[PDB]
């Protein structure tokens, strides 16, 4: 941007994005995650669709959140951030920071970790590492930063 | 130096003027539910949405129950 | 195919 | 019957007013003098935290809430329209706002609302009245009945006790309105300048320490209209994360560049200037024509103090300059309340601008700056706010006026030091006693401000609802104000209360706290090192004569 | 792989320690202000009334630079308070009361505590008075329309201001951080074109949600001192589905036959001709402070989201009750604005049928204003002092543009000087006091030049205001000549 919209960016530290690197931030991702897990089985099904299902409503969660909305929740100056995600605010614009790898490293963990269950189909197989792959890395990669279709 | 002040006494104040163990029990009820109820955000939600969390985490319990 | 897949995303892990 | 009332005033006797304005002391010994600290540095500050699950669980509330908002959001907006036409278009008129960037302040602001914006009535001085109200539809519109019932007054600014009505600068007003008149003519570069203006000129600069001062009619309007006469787009500014908002909107104004540095780490301040030295100007790296390093006396969120001393090495080494801001220091710190300056026994003379603002602690409005002669002159020349904005009123110069002497000790000499002694003494006893039963509080040693930790969005409203029902009046803030995971209470210590109502108040929030699990305090915030969580009788009975000593106190 | 690089260069190896170290102590800073220019502009600070123990009104005892001069039972023109209803008993008891039952301070910002009764009693009488649904109060007028206009507006919205506003207007156009056009000051015809040509464009984008739009005025202008056409500006805000904002501080209370406006005066609805109204409780209410007035949707979002209101505390207690008590004597009877209207009237004819004064100086205010403003003549300026305004206004907002930090400027001080002089001229003669326009031009973006000032005030006879008249007509001859 301009000098104007930086120097408005630049004013205020960013309340939006600057929680994630705060107490207790890290561990929230796996503690949502352990709990998807005792809620599925609960629904009572048998282990592939348990985990499947925890898999796919996380990765889906979290690009809900992150990837979708554009600005802030509130007023920044006169916005500053109109056509920015939450992800790309994060440390404000500085990549492959440990807070970034971390969120990286996450959803590989998720399906390593899943596969040993639904390994024996190919439909859940093919499906699962699809929307791994194509609904959470790949956004968060440096080259589809700032990039709209 | 007496003020135009009106003074509340403390709950304790209240028990002693108004002076065996199921009294106990029902306080300690009285004690879990208050800490069940300030941990979860109730105080923001309108009725329905409390009402059913509420549901929610009463059939979450009973499931587990069940099943263990 | 199984290995090869984890190995690989070991490999993109590191 | 929606609309407020307009009450009535009480006939009650004089003593019992002054009863209610200000409690006369009762014994001698609770009274505290402070000592400087003669350049000596502030150790870093000891942060306490509470444990992972509450973290973990506020964490759990914030993204319920989100979720439970927008999903609210999408189905009003998607089906009922017709009950939602100030949030959508008509007859190719948008609307007002948006119903994006004002989320927050709905969905979550608006089911606590009756925490905010409580109406009073009469003086805010140790007892504030307040006008009880029913909420209607959860907080949509109130309606009001004609009680009105005094609570305890731990809210308002009100640190020398200065807000009475039957004191001798009440006197000095009214002498000021039969005198002079509550008008003024113009801008003070017109017509509105009286001799009174400039009496509190030199009365300011005396006081203070410096050559010369002007007198503003607002300290918002003060800070925001400062910067752009001294300032431009080739020039720098760096600024704590943590300042006021109208000395952001006062550099925005401009157009200077703005970076900030972490609160209380002056390494990272000394590398951001190396290498904003180094870079230069953006896009071009030709140097920068002028750097200006901003910061607070004392930050009204946390308590802690500005290291002052190492700011001054800075500054004198790497050519910069310093501009502080003393809103919440002066008037109510130090040995004889000359603000920072005299708390650090620093000359005040390396410190180029200093500006505050008589609301705080002398009961008045406005606002004032202070530095070398050729740089006032030059202000006020330069100054926008001298030369198109009103001048401010007799009464309040005559309270300013009549405050400034009582402090400074010029009349009725025995008031200035008995405050001063009042507000330290108290504000180490309420630090020493929340810390000892077992909470988790901010500040240094003497700050007025007191902040609690709360660290559940569940929690501000239930603190502040129980203690409305002792008749305890308090301030909550929220997450657009404070860090996401803390929120807290802020309470503001007055020179006007009595060790009573200090025992008054601890006793109701001991058993308040205990209640809603908010003793979480760990052993790092101890002298020894192990964590305590002493009874209520015996801390009472212990700390009115432990408070006096400065070893206690990890700050 | 090889054959798809992209041939750089190796990157240079980074300073250290000492080279930083030499560098540091290399760079030198400019001083805080510049005090090259200080002492030949300082007779603006040495030539400033000061009166001594006595409110500021028709007959005062004023002393200039440090006591150094001195004169008594000087006639006042040049006082902002206009209908001088803040200076009998009434007020003067009502203000008693409220400061022996209140304190003198809030103590406090409106968000918590300090919004007293007093206040909200005020909102209402406000609302009530001019015909509106809600008002809000704030601390200083000066920092009313810098909050309010960019609370409404980002980047994104569209903006069409007239061509010469005074500087809280500029402020709030410059912080709105929105796009800003604009017309010619009164000429219909631009604006006309302008709102068409904006609009056609508009059409032809297709943009998914369309943006606020708003077209900013002023009811009387501070520095020409001319009455703004309403009628048109509504048709076409209503034609073309445009917002209205209009800056009304010195029309409030002299306008109207009972003193409500430039509403009034046109035989309006407050309600459905303007949008946003700003006033000041400073010049025609005798006492300090602004307010904003509009529906009850506007209102709350300012309370919600207004800077200069959230985060500064709440204006004391015997101000509000003062204007409260003035409202209600207003609303009585007028006598008062009927007065003010037949002074100005003749200040303006006395001042306008003159063929002696037709060469040198030129009337610029309206007969409906209460300050009439006198400028001189660009062909005799260009005579005496060799530059016209365009000039003037290219010079500044190059410097400006370029950012020196002397932005000095010869021939408008001697300008300056020169009015200055015919000020001195008539006090010291005539023991008449008259003001001159006090601006900061480094600080105006749009086109202006010095000017004068007369201002007439409800507490005047009109034999001593011709007499008035005719030593100022006598003084400006003497200096021109």
């Not at chain 2, 939600?45 to 587990?64: K, P």
């Not at chain 4, 606002?367 to 009103?390: C, F, N, P």
């Not at chain 5, 304190?103 to 300090?114: I, N, Q, S």
Request: aromatic share 10%.
């Amino acid at each position: 941007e301009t000098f104007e919209d930086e120097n408005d960016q630049q004013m205020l530290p960013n309340m939006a994005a600057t929680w994630v690197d705060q107490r207790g931030a890290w561990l929230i991702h796996i503690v949502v995650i352990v709990l998807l897990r005792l809620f599925y089985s609960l629904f009572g099904s048998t282990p592939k669709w348990t985990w499947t299902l925890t898999n796919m409503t996380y990765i889906i969660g979290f690009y809900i959140m992150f990837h979708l909305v554009k600005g802030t929740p509130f007023d920044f100056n006169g916005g500053a951030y109109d056509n920015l995600t939450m992800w790309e605010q994060i440390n404000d614009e500085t990549l492959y920071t440990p807070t970034r790898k971390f969120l990286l490293i996450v959803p590989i963990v998720l399906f390593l970790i899943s596969n040993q269950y639904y390994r024996n189909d190919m439909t859940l197989f093919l499906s699962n590492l699809a929307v791994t792959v194509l609904i959470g890395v790949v956004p968060k990669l440096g080259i589809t930063h700032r990039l709209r279709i | 130096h007496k003020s135009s002040m009106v003074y509340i006494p403390t709950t304790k104040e209240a028990k002693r003027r108004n002076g065996g163990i199921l009294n106990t029990i029902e306080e300690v009820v009285e004690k879990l539910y208050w800490t069940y109820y300030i941990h979860l955000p109730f105080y923001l939600m309108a009725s329905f949405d409390s009402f059913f969390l509420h549901v929610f985490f009463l059939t979450i319990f009973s499931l587990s129950f069940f099943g263990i | 195919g199984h290995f090869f897949v984890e190995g690989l995303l070991g490999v993109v892990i590191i | 019957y929606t609309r407020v009332p307009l009450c009535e005033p009480e006939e009650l006797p004089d003593d019992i007013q002054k009863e209610n304005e200000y409690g006369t002391l009762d014994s001698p010994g609770h009274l505290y003098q402070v000592k400087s600290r003669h350049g000596k540095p502030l150790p870093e500050p000891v942060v306490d935290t509470p444990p992972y699950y509450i973290s973990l669980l506020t964490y759990l509330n914030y993204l319920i809430l989100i979720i439970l908002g927008h999903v609210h959001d999408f189905l009003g907006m998607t089906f009922q329209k017709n009950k939602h036409l100030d949030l959508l278009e008509h007859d190719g008129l948008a609307p007002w706002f948006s119903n994006f960037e004002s989320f927050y302040v709905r969905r979550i602001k608006m089911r606590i609302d009756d925490c905010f914006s409580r109406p009073t009535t009469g003086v805010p001085g140790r007892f504030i009245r307040c006008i009880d109200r029913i909420s209607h539809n959860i907080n949509e519109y109130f309606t009001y009945s004609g009680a009105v019932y005094p609570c305890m007054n731990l809210s308002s600014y009100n640190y020398l006790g200065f807000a009475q009505s039957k004191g001798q600068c009440t006197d000095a007003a009214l002498e000021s309105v039969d005198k002079y008149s509550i008008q003024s003519g113009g801008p003070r570069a017109q017509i509105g300048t009286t001799d009174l203006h400039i009496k509190a000129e030199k009365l300011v600069a005396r006081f203070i320490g410096k050559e010369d001062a002007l007198v503003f009619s607002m300290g918002y309007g003060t800070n925001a209209n400062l910067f752009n006469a001294f300032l431009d787009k080739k020039c720098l500014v760096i600024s704590d994360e943590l300042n006021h908002t109208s000395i952001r909107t006062g550099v925005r104004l401009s157009g200077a560049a703005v970076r900030t540095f972490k609160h209380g780490d002056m390494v990272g301040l000394e590398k951001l200037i190396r290498e904003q030295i180094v870079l230069g100007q953006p896009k071009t790296n030709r140097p920068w024509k002028k750097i200006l390093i901003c910061a607070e006396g004392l930050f009204s969120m946390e308590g802690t103090l500005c290291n002052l001393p190492k700011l001054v090495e800075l500054k004198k080494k790497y050519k910069c300059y310093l501009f502080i801001d003393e809103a919440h220091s002066i008037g109510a710190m130090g040995p004889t309340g000359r603000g920072v300056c005299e708390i650090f026994g620093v000359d005040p003379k390396d410190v180029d601008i200093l500006m505050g603002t008589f609301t705080k602690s002398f009961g008045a409005a406005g606002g004032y700056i202070a530095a070398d002669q050729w740089i006032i002159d030059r202000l006020r020349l330069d100054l926008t706010t001298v030369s198109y904005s009103e001048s401010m009123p007799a009464p309040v110069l005559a309270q300013t006026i009549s405050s400034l002497q009582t402090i400074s000790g010029e009349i009725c000499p025995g008031q200035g030091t008995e405050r001063l002694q009042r507000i330290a003494f108290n504000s180490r006893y309420l630090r020493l006693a929340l810390q000892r039963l077992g909470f988790i509080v901010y500040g240094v040693a003497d700050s007025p401000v007191i902040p609690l930790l709360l660290y559940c969005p569940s929690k501000m409203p239930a603190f502040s609802r129980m203690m409305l029902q002792r008749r305890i009046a308090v301030v909550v803030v929220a997450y657009p104000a404070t860090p996401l995971i803390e929120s807290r209470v802020r309470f503001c210590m007055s020179a006007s209360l009595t060790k009573e109502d200090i025992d008054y108040l601890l006793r109701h929030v001991s058993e308040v706290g205990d209640k809603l699990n908010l003793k979480s305090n760990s052993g790092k915030s101890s002298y020894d090192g192990k964590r305590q969580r002493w009874d209520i009788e015996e801390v009472i009975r212990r700390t009115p004569e432990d408070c006096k000593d400065d070893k206690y106190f990890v700050n | 792989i090889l054959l798809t690089r992209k041939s750089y260069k190796p990157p240079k190896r980074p300073l250290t320690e000492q080279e930083i170290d030499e560098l540091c102590d290399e760079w030198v800073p400019e001083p805080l202000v510049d005090p090259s220019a200080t002492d030949e502009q300082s007779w603006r600070v040495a030539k400033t009334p000061v009166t001594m123990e006595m409110p500021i009104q028709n007959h005062i005892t004023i002393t200039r630079n440090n006591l150094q001069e001195k004169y008594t039972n000087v006639f006042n023109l040049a006082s902002n308070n206009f209908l001088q209803l803040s200076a009998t008993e009434p007020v003067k008891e009502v203000v008693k009361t409220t400061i022996k039952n209140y304190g003198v301070g809030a103590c406090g910002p409106a968000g918590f505590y300090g919004n007293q009764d007093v206040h909200y009693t005020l909102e209402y009488d406000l609302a009530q008075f001019f015909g509106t649904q809600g008002s809000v109060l704030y601390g200083q007028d000066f920092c009313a329309a810098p909050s309010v206009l960019p609370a409404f507006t980002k980047r994104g919205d569209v903006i069409v201001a007239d061509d010469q506003v005074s500087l809280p207007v500029q402020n709030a156009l410059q912080l709105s951080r929105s796009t800003v056009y604009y017309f010619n000051h009164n000429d219909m015809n631009s604006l006309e074109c302008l709102l068409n040509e904006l609009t056609e464009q508009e059409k032809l984008e297709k943009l998914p949600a369309i943006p606020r739009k708003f077209i900013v005025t002023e009811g009387i202008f501070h520095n020409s001192g001319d009455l703004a056409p309403l009628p048109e500006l509504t048709k076409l805000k209503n034609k073309y589905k445009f917002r209205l904002f209009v800056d009304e501080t010195f029309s409030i209370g002299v306008l109207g036959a009972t003193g409500r406006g430039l509403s009034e005066h046109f035989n309006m609805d407050r309600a459905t001709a303007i949008d946003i109204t700003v006033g000041s409780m400073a010049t025609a209410l005798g006492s300090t402070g602004g307010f904003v007035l509009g529906d009850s949707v506007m209102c709350l979002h300012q309370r919600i989201g207004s800077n200069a209101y959230c985060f500064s505390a709440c204006l004391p207690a015997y101000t509000v009750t003062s204007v409260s008590k003035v409202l209600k004597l207003m609303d009585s009877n007028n006598d008062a604005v009927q007065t003010l209207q037949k002074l100005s009237k003749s200040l303006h004819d006395s001042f306008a049928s003159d063929d002696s004064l037709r060469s040198y100086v030129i009337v610029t205010s309206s007969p409906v204003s209460a300050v009439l403003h006198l400028q001189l003549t660009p062909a005799y300026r260009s005579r005496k002092f060799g530059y016209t305004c365009e000039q003037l206004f290219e010079t500044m907002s190059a410097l400006q543009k370029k950012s020196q930090t002397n932005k000095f400027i010869e021939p408008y001080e001697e300008e300056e000087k020169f009015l200055q002089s015919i000020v001195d001229h008539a006090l010291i003669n005539y023991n008449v006091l008259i003001t001159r326009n006090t601006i900061v031009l480094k600080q105006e973006t749009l086109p202006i030049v010095p000017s004068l000032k007369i201002c007439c005030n409800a507490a005047m006879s009109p034999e001593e205001l011709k007499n008035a008249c005719e030593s100022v007509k006598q003084s400006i001859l003497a200096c021109c000549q």
